[PDB]
Scaffold this motif. Structure first.
Motif, PDB file in Angstrom:
ATOM      1  N   UNK A  94       0.849  -1.182   0.000  1.00 13.69           N
ATOM      2  CA  UNK A  94       0.000   0.000   0.000  1.00 13.69           C
ATOM      3  C   UNK A  94       0.890   1.240   0.000  1.00 13.69           C
ATOM      4  N   UNK A  95       2.188   1.002  -0.163  1.00 15.97           N
ATOM      5  CA  UNK A  95       3.211   2.045  -0.236  1.00 15.97           C
ATOM      6  C   UNK A  95       3.302   2.943   0.995  1.00 15.97           C
ATOM      7  N   UNK A  96       3.127   2.353   2.178  1.00 14.48           N
ATOM      8  CA  UNK A  96       3.185   3.110   3.430  1.00 14.48           C
ATOM      9  C   UNK A  96       4.613   3.410   3.875  1.00 14.48           C
ATOM     10  N   UNK A  97       5.561   2.606   3.409  1.00 15.70           N
ATOM     11  CA  UNK A  97       6.970   2.871   3.674  1.00 15.70           C
ATOM     12  C   UNK A  97       7.408   4.193   3.030  1.00 15.70           C
ATOM     13  N   UNK A  98       6.967   4.424   1.796  1.00 14.32           N
ATOM     14  CA  UNK A  98       7.301   5.647   1.070  1.00 14.32           C
ATOM     15  C   UNK A  98       6.863   6.889   1.839  1.00 14.32           C
ATOM     16  N   UNK A  99       5.656   6.827   2.397  1.00 11.58           N
ATOM     17  CA  UNK A  99       5.106   7.919   3.194  1.00 11.58           C
ATOM     18  C   UNK A  99       5.873   8.094   4.507  1.00 11.58           C
ATOM     19  N   UNK A 100       6.158   6.984   5.181  1.00 16.05           N
ATOM     20  CA  UNK A 100       6.985   7.013   6.384  1.00 16.05           C
ATOM     21  C   UNK A 100       8.347   7.623   6.064  1.00 16.05           C
ATOM     22  N   UNK A 101       8.883   7.272   4.900  1.00 14.81           N
ATOM     23  CA  UNK A 101      10.166   7.800   4.458  1.00 14.81           C
ATOM     24  C   UNK A 101      10.142   9.326   4.392  1.00 14.81           C
ATOM     25  N   UNK A 102       8.970   9.897   4.140  1.00 16.49           N
ATOM     26  CA  UNK A 102       8.845  11.352   4.086  1.00 16.49           C
ATOM     27  C   UNK A 102       8.945  11.954   5.482  1.00 16.49           C
ATOM     28  N   UNK A 103       8.683  11.131   6.490  1.00 11.58           N
ATOM     29  CA  UNK A 103       8.710  11.580   7.868  1.00 11.58           C
ATOM     30  C   UNK A 103       7.322  11.656   8.473  1.00 11.58           C
ATOM     31  N   UNK A 104       6.347  11.020   7.828  1.00 13.11           N
ATOM     32  CA  UNK A 104       4.996  11.001   8.382  1.00 13.11           C
ATOM     33  C   UNK A 104       4.609   9.596   8.797  1.00 13.11           C
ATOM     34  N   UNK A 105       4.445   9.412  10.104  1.00 12.97           N
ATOM     35  CA  UNK A 105       4.286   8.085  10.675  1.00 12.97           C
ATOM     36  C   UNK A 105       3.050   7.985  11.557  1.00 12.97           C
ATOM     37  N   UNK A 106       2.226   9.023  11.521  1.00  7.29           N
ATOM     38  CA  UNK A 106       0.974   9.019  12.254  1.00  7.29           C
ATOM     39  C   UNK A 106       1.089   9.636  13.628  1.00  7.29           C
ATOM     40  N   UNK A 107       2.201  10.316  13.885  1.00  3.61           N
ATOM     41  CA  UNK A 107       2.427  10.919  15.194  1.00  3.61           C
ATOM     42  C   UNK A 107       1.232  11.761  15.636  1.00  3.61           C
ATOM     43  N   UNK A 108       0.903  11.674  16.921  1.00  4.92           N
ATOM     44  CA  UNK A 108      -0.195  12.448  17.496  1.00  4.92           C
ATOM     45  C   UNK A 108      -1.558  12.192  16.859  1.00  4.92           C
ATOM     46  N   UNK A 109      -1.684  11.083  16.143  1.00  4.87           N
ATOM     47  CA  UNK A 109      -2.971  10.677  15.611  1.00  4.87           C
ATOM     48  C   UNK A 109      -3.539   9.586  16.501  1.00  4.87           C
ATOM     49  N   UNK A 110      -4.754   9.800  16.990  1.00  5.81           N
ATOM     50  CA  UNK A 110      -5.373   8.874  17.928  1.00  5.81           C
ATOM     51  C   UNK A 110      -6.169   7.807  17.200  1.00  5.81           C
ATOM     52  N   UNK A 111      -5.733   6.562  17.342  1.00 10.41           N
ATOM     53  CA  UNK A 111      -6.411   5.455  16.685  1.00 10.41           C
ATOM     54  C   UNK A 111      -6.951   4.460  17.696  1.00 10.41           C
ATOM     55  N   UNK A 112      -8.209   4.083  17.520  1.00 12.04           N
ATOM     56  CA  UNK A 112      -8.840   3.147  18.427  1.00 12.04           C
ATOM     57  C   UNK A 112      -9.128   1.839  17.709  1.00 12.04           C
ATOM     58  N   UNK A 113      -8.640   0.751  18.292  1.00 13.42           N
ATOM     59  CA  UNK A 113      -8.870  -0.588  17.780  1.00 13.42           C
ATOM     60  C   UNK A 113      -9.965  -1.258  18.611  1.00 13.42           C
ATOM     61  N   UNK A 152      -5.305  -9.112  26.041  1.00 14.89           N
ATOM     62  CA  UNK A 152      -6.016  -9.672  24.905  1.00 14.89           C
ATOM     63  C   UNK A 152      -5.999 -11.182  25.064  1.00 14.89           C
ATOM     64  N   UNK A 153      -7.128 -11.751  25.462  1.00 21.08           N
ATOM     65  CA  UNK A 153      -7.202 -13.183  25.680  1.00 21.08           C
ATOM     66  C   UNK A 153      -7.452 -13.974  24.409  1.00 21.08           C
ATOM     67  N   UNK A 154      -7.598 -13.278  23.287  1.00 22.14           N
ATOM     68  CA  UNK A 154      -7.913 -13.943  22.031  1.00 22.14           C
ATOM     69  C   UNK A 154      -6.734 -14.011  21.065  1.00 22.14           C
ATOM     70  N   UNK A 155      -6.159 -12.852  20.762  1.00 26.33           N
ATOM     71  CA  UNK A 155      -5.054 -12.762  19.827  1.00 26.33           C
ATOM     72  C   UNK A 155      -5.356 -11.835  18.665  1.00 26.33           C
ATOM     73  N   UNK A 156      -6.620 -11.828  18.257  1.00 30.20           N
ATOM     74  CA  UNK A 156      -7.096 -11.027  17.137  1.00 30.20           C
ATOM     75  C   UNK A 156      -6.775  -9.542  17.315  1.00 30.20           C
ATOM     76  N   UNK A 157      -7.226  -8.969  18.427  1.00 21.69           N
ATOM     77  CA  UNK A 157      -7.023  -7.557  18.700  1.00 21.69           C
ATOM     78  C   UNK A 157      -5.582  -7.093  18.569  1.00 21.69           C
ATOM     79  N   UNK A 158      -4.657  -7.950  18.988  1.00 21.05           N
ATOM     80  CA  UNK A 158      -3.245  -7.609  19.026  1.00 21.05           C
ATOM     81  C   UNK A 158      -2.655  -7.687  17.625  1.00 21.05           C
ATOM     82  N   UNK A 159      -3.185  -8.602  16.823  1.00 29.14           N
ATOM     83  CA  UNK A 159      -2.743  -8.723  15.445  1.00 29.14           C
ATOM     84  C   UNK A 159      -3.079  -7.450  14.687  1.00 29.14           C
ATOM     85  N   UNK A 160      -4.361  -7.095  14.707  1.00 28.16           N
ATOM     86  CA  UNK A 160      -4.859  -5.885  14.076  1.00 28.16           C
ATOM     87  C   UNK A 160      -4.092  -4.639  14.515  1.00 28.16           C
ATOM     88  N   UNK A 161      -3.881  -4.493  15.818  1.00 34.53           N
ATOM     89  CA  UNK A 161      -3.153  -3.330  16.318  1.00 34.53           C
ATOM     90  C   UNK A 161      -1.735  -3.282  15.743  1.00 34.53           C
TER      91      UNK A 161
END
Lengths: 274, 75, 269, 274
Positions: free
Chosen positions: C11-30, C59-68
């Motif tokens: 999904x070319x997310x490395x290229x974006x990270x390479x620019x210096x944008x890594x989601x800092x200060x963005x609040x994500x809820x799983x 996480x007693x299942x495993x799913x949640x941690x994978x997704x995160x």
């Protein structure tokens, strides 16, 4: 910090770029040793690998990366400048790090590029013979609207003998020979009745792994100039069929000598894209 | 009601496959304890196109993935 | 020592990270079975629990941690690498250790996210039915500026909820060859595709694992939104969303691919 | 911009087409993963879906579309050309996006095909075991006037071993193997005594989902040649029974060697339709 290799103005691609056509939205597959995607002056949009154990977006050789930069080195603040710098560049890897590949892998890449709607194929590669499959692939690709370009070969000339290899020798492929900055033919450039057009192929400066630049020689360098040119034509005339594009390149070429040695002449994209 | 969308398919005793055990249970179906009970699915197909696109697997490779998969439930 | 799952560069997310944008200060809820906070490659910064007896940091299942992990595994010498590794990550437990949740449980999770100012919600979960409270919760989250992402479902028009709601981004799955996965749902509501086959990520008990599902694909999009917002912090929920789908790489019929494979580099231009 | 795949001239379907007989009025049903109806080079006029969630006019695999293209790709200014380009094309979806199915789903398509009056039935598919509900579906279709073709399988050969698959092994179904451009047997093609004829199944080029084209292998590509070679005999001699169209195709075939490997041989549409 950006250098314009001499090849770009020589085919007058610099003129057509100034018109505002850079191959934007044209899809070009480079069938080679892959491409160093992470390179700063290149944007590899996608592609496929038909070399086991190798991904399409790396290049352990250098060859393909070099060819890519000639077609589409990013027009920006650094490195070099491609012939069509807005092209959608695809890396189809059919040769390994050593530079070698099978007939089936190359055919695979040509079939993929057909299926996947590439507008232009560059094949800076060849051999003494081809194959029925390789032929069927290029014919079909050409019939689909793909300009198919190939290096003619580096076996030079000797009297009467034809030295064009496959796929260049196939008539659905544009066989491309090489000249220097003086528009003189390069002593290694193959000759034959199928030789179609000439392009810069000696002292060609382009991109090179890792994140550097290199001067190479060969018709492998010449081919991608025609490949880019085809993309420029299309960016100005998205309407044109594969033949219309091809014929424009071959019948607006600057005369350089007998066609056994120079084909129809040196490509002139400004004239081609009129 | 409401399960995780992992695809860890399970064979229901009723001859229908469910995406994972949690879905198996929401439907109220029992495990089949026999993948044969779900012949002609994908993890256990009884058909396949006759396209030649061979796969490793072992000695008796496979004309295609479907032919390789025509050996039930496997990983 | 760190491993880059194929899905990140795809999904070319490395290229974006390479620019210096890594989601800092963005609040994500799983919204999931929780997250193993103590995992070396994960940094859980907060969350809440609506599962009787359990905190959010397990996480007693495993799913949640994978997704995160797919969203935000730490850019390290260790483990794997997330789409948006600098993200502010919150575990909102709405599914039990067996992976099941109730509509009100999931509704509580949504409302908590909306109230606590989450930028992105990921919901790698689904049901056959919807519920008015759930439709009401996602609508309100989106209207308040939450990018809501969900797994289109693996049922294979058998898209489920909450993906089927139009205030929610419905995400299908492709493999490393960019091909649709057999298990990926299809239909009119399918919005974009992301990697969901053979996805390698953090797994409970300081380890890692490879899972299959549109559950693996969803968090790629959720992460893609964090990346976009760390670069353009000012965009609205609908702006980010449209920016993800309008720059998708075409894959074919929208019934099977929606807009096609996301491309964050394009989406973040 | 339309190429003719090497399959059409190799079975001599071009000779018959040249006489004006292109399979008009003949109803051919492709029991596959469906067809991309909106594909420019395809006219799907009917059919039915037997896979939950998906219609009959979409193809999520590609196979189906590439099988139907080999039969009835529009004879137009673009794309490819089918053996019987004038056929009324029907899409019976019995396979899933993964190219798999249940014996029950196939029996359903066969039955639907018999009820709606298909002249030719093509099945590029086959399991190792049969089922009485499928042997019954076909037997009751053949006896009713419907010509039934199917891929012989890609199980190759070792010793006297019969490697023919169902529903190709049935006597009421035409078992079609595969050859290459040089008329040689594809080393993957199933052997056996049920093997009836050969046909192009090596590097076959045809329509492919989302408005494009691909080059495929397998006896799945061989089948739509014979399936189309039947739609032609019925446009020129539209009064022959299912058994006459069949006897003609096999009698007038070109012997290529042992019938355990080549069956009768490469079909000659020109001879079978004389």
């Amino acid at each position: 910090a950006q250098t314009v290799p001499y090849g770009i103005p020589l085919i007058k691609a610099d003129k057509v770029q100034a018109q505002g056509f850079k191959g934007a939205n044209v899809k070009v597959a480079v069938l080679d040793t892959g491409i160093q995607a992470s390179h700063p002056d290149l944007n590899v949009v996608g592609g496929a690998s038909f070399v086991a154990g190798e991904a399409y977006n790396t290049d352990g050789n250098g060859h393909g990366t070099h060819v890519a930069g000639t077609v589409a080195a990013l027009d920006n603040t650094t490195g070099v400048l491609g012939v069509a710098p807005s092209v959608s560049l695809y890396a189809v890897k059919v040769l390994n790090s050593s530079g070698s590949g099978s007939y089936s892998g190359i055919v695979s890449g040509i079939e993929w590029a057909t299926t996947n709607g590439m507008d232009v194929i560059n094949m800076s590669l060849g051999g003494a013979s081809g194959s029925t499959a390789m032929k069927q692939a290029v014919d079909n690709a050409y019939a689909r609207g793909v300009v198919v370009v190939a290096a003619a070969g580096n076996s030079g000339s000797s009297g009467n003998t034809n030295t064009i290899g496959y796929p260049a020798k196939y008539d659905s492929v544009i066989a491309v020979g090489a000249v220097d900055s003086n528009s003189n033919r390069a002593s290694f450039s193959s000759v034959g009745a199928e030789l179609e057009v000439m392009a810069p192929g000696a002292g060609v400066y382009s991109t090179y792994p890792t994140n550097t630049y290199a001067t190479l020689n060969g018709t492998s360098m010449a081919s991608p100039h025609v490949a880019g040119a085809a993309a420029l034509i299309l960016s100005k005339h998205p309407n044109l069929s594969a033949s219309q594009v091809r014929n424009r390149l071959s019948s607006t070429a600057t005369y350089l000598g007998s066609s056994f040695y120079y084909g129809k002449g040196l490509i002139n994209v400004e004239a081609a894209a009129q | 009601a409401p399960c995780p969308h992992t695809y860890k398919p399970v064979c229901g005793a009723n001859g229908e496959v469910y995406d994972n055990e949690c879905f198996l249970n929401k439907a109220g179906i029992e495990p089949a304890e026999s993948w044969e009970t779900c012949r002609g699915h994908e993890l256990c197909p009884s058909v396949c196109t006759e396209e030649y696109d061979p796969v490793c697997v072992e000695g008796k490779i496979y004309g295609n993935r479907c032919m390789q998969s025509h050996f039930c439930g496997k990983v």
